[PDB]
């Protein structure tokens, strides 16, 4: 019967909550209160990229810290040269409702997808001088929301059908399927060692998954609304999330408990994207208020404002070596700060 | 740009910048429309007359040398809250209602109320189509079904003076048709503050005149938008 199973689930949840509460020892703010603050950070716009027609939805930095790819609501993919402000490639898309884009670590392939329920792979290094599509990954029910490369033959995609999957470009089949979320998944993040990954959904919860095992290992809660973006800490034991209630949190994998909260009373809008610096000292988050706030990851103090966009910031990105930071917006303009 | 390779790269970038100018012109001349409905509503029949886990459908039609692009949502989950914000710049939204079943009309009114009050759907006008009108006529002449059994306010209703019953076959049919229309009309006029409008219409099984109606509605919608910006309205 369903009567005893619900009580058993409730008492397991109560036991888990009690164990987590007993695990709590002290707040990170108390430990960090005896460190001098970073100060005032003042970045300025160094480059401006123009050429996009419709709204910009996503972007991804390259591993060489010089090239990047961006997606537009009109169905175009453009590869930019950050130093000389030149355009390298311009790939038209079959479907204009693209929502995400990814860049391969080796620099040989790019990926994109959207409401078409299809993830496409484009080959950049061909004998003939033209970008052509290699494979289309079909099988999802909802819309594609995020995608990240693991190597030249493995990719992880997030879809709106509340399920994640691991694909294989060589065979075009779903190697592994991840289930458990009740709401649709909006974003995912990968670890530097590519052994584990996390994702967030509209059920105000985040889960940690194992690539080979294909099973969930840990769950995080605490947000009052849906999850919009997720970023993963450089160490490999922490990650940060962003929601629509003007609130961001930091979670610890080993401690299994929420860290301090980054929020302000003057913000009523929602977070769209989050990122970390090279050393993990500064946290950058886009908002609906046309600005990009900069926070201190250790003292929870806001130090720096990145203003200059005419519409909402839809995506963010920090380069591999930390030289610069790139922002995208619905005004079809990309700005590089330093 | 001192090196010859840099000059060639600059020339390639200029070439790329010039094919992105042709696209602009084509985009600035098109109009995008969003099609919404339900399983019972014959939107598929309408879009077929106008002419795998697929995500979105696209249909193209032209009238008076003007191109319209319409997007129909395919296989998707029952939740539409998240992806509805990507259509906040379309010309108009077409809604199809099946006026043949009972409490499915109630579901249609609930869906219309939900869509009308959406925050991300502001400054967007809605075109309303009342489909399958012949079934409504055939379902009242034979009796065996009463609207008053589901809507108790049907008895306290009468045909309005401004009504124009072009067929005029039976007063009861006109009364029911105008009651059903006025329900959606009152829902639409319950709010809006003049920023957007509703254009209801009566659609038949084939009705090979909906393109002209959509063209006229779109023309009317853009003229008011331009008159508001230059303070004449």
């Amino acid at each position: 019967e369903l009567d005893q199973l619900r009580q058993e689930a409730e008492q397991l949840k109560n036991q888990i909550r009690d164990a987590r509460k007993a695990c709590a020892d002290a707040t990170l703010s108390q430990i960090t209160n005896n460190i001098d603050p970073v100060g005032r950070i003042q970045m300025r716009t160094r480059r401006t990229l123009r050429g996009h027609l419709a709204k910009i939805y996503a972007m991804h930095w390259g591993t060489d810290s010089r090239l990047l790819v961006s997606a537009s609501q009109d169905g175009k993919l453009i590869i930019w040269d950050s130093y000389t402000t030149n355009k390298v490639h311009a790939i038209p898309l079959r479907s204009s409702w693209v929502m995400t884009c990814a860049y391969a670590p080796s620099g040989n392939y790019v990926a994109c997808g959207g409401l078409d329920n299809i993830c496409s792979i484009y080959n950049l290094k061909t004998r003939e001088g033209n970008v052509r599509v290699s494979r289309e990954l079909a099988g999802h029910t909802g819309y594609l929301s995020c995608c990240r490369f693991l190597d030249d033959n493995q990719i992880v995609t997030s879809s709106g059908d509340t399920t994640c999957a691991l694909w294989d470009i060589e065979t075009g089949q779903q190697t592994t399927t991840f289930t458990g979320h009740t709401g649709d998944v909006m974003s995912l993040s990968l670890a530097p060692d590519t052994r584990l990954f996390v994702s967030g959904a509209c059920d105000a919860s985040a889960k940690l998954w194992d690539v080979r095992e294909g099973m969930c290992r840990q769950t995080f809660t605490g947000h009052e609304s849906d999850i919009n973006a997720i970023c993963f800490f450089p160490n490999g034991n922490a990650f940060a999330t962003g929601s629509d209630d003007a609130t961001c949190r930091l979670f610890d994998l080993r401690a299994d408990q929420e860290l301090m909260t980054y929020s302000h009373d003057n913000i009523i809008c929602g977070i769209t994207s989050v990122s970390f610096s090279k050393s993990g000292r500064l946290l950058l988050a886009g908002y609906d208020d046309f600005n990009c706030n900069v926070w201190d990851a250790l003292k929870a103090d806001r130090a720096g404002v990145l203003a200059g966009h005419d519409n909402r910031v839809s995506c963010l990105g920090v380069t591999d070596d930390g030289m610069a930071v790139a922002t995208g917006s619905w005004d079809s303009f990309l700005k590089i700060w330093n | 740009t001192l090196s010859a390779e840099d000059k060639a790269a600059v020339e390639r970038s200029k070439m790329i910048e010039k094919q992105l100018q042709k696209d602009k012109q084509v985009y600035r001349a098109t109009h995008r429309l969003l099609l919404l409905g339900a399983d019972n509503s014959g939107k598929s029949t309408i879009v077929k007359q106008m002419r795998k886990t697929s995500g979105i459908f696209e249909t193209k039609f032209q009238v008076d040398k003007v191109n319209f692009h319409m997007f129909d949502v395919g296989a998707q989950r029952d939740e539409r809250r998240k992806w509805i914000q990507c259509f906040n710049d379309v010309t108009a939204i077409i809604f199809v209602v099946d006026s043949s079943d009972y409490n499915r009309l109630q579901e249609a009114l609930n869906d219309f109320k939900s869509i009308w009050n959406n925050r991300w759907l502001r400054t967007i006008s809605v075109i309303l189509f009342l489909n399958k009108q012949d079934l409504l006529a055939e379902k009242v002449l034979a009796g065996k079904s009463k609207i008053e059994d589901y809507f108790p306010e049907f008895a306290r209703y009468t045909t309005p003076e401004d009504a124009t019953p072009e067929p005029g076959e039976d007063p009861r049919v006109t009364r029911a048709k105008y009651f059903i229309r006025d329900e959606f009309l009152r829902i639409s006029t319950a709010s809006g503050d003049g920023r957007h409008y509703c254009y209801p219409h009566f659609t038949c099984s084939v009705d090979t005149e909906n393109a002209r109606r959509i063209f006229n509605d779109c023309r009317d919608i853009i003229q008011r938008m331009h008159l508001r910006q230059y303070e004449l309205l």
Partner: single-chain antibody
Amino acid sequence: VQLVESGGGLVQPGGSRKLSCSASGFAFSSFGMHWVRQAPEKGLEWVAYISSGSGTIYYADTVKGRFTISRDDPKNTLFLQMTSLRSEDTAMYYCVRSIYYYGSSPFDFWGQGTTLTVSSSSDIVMTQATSSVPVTPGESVSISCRSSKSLLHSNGNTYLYWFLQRPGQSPQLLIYRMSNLASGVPDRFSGSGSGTAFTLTISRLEAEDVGVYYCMQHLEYPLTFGAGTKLEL
């Protein structure tokens, strides 16, 4: 991916002929084209060049008012016009594809060549100290190249190229920008330099390494070639 050339023959002095190079198997409209001349018993020499957009055209200082180049994107065919042929205008001609962007590898594929026989300053000087050397099938081989000016640019690139034309076939590409290896070249060739003197190192050796190695630079676009060193096994 194959290039075919047509024309050639023996003509009287003062004549005129039109040379063509036909492309097939790739997007010919996005690659620049060069003409390279090679005497029967001498090295290579550049002739002319047309960019992808036909907005930039260069000519060799040897002949500028007698040679005309043209291209046709729709049918993917290159053209070369020669007027008032002289005694010196007798050599082998090749058409070379090239594309310029970040990370690109220009001068990657060459044509077959057509023969044409005629009856009887401020540019960087590139020289090669050696011309022939016998080696052992399995030991190391070192080839040195010299320049009269620093090839290093302010950005940080060193424009040096290695071709190694085989004795009986068209040239190839081994090292571009003095440090990067090509696609189909086995991972046994390497190159290094300091800014004025450069060396080419081959770890292993096989029967297919027999040929003449050429030296070329692309700094300020004089396009001057080297002398060439022949290897015999």
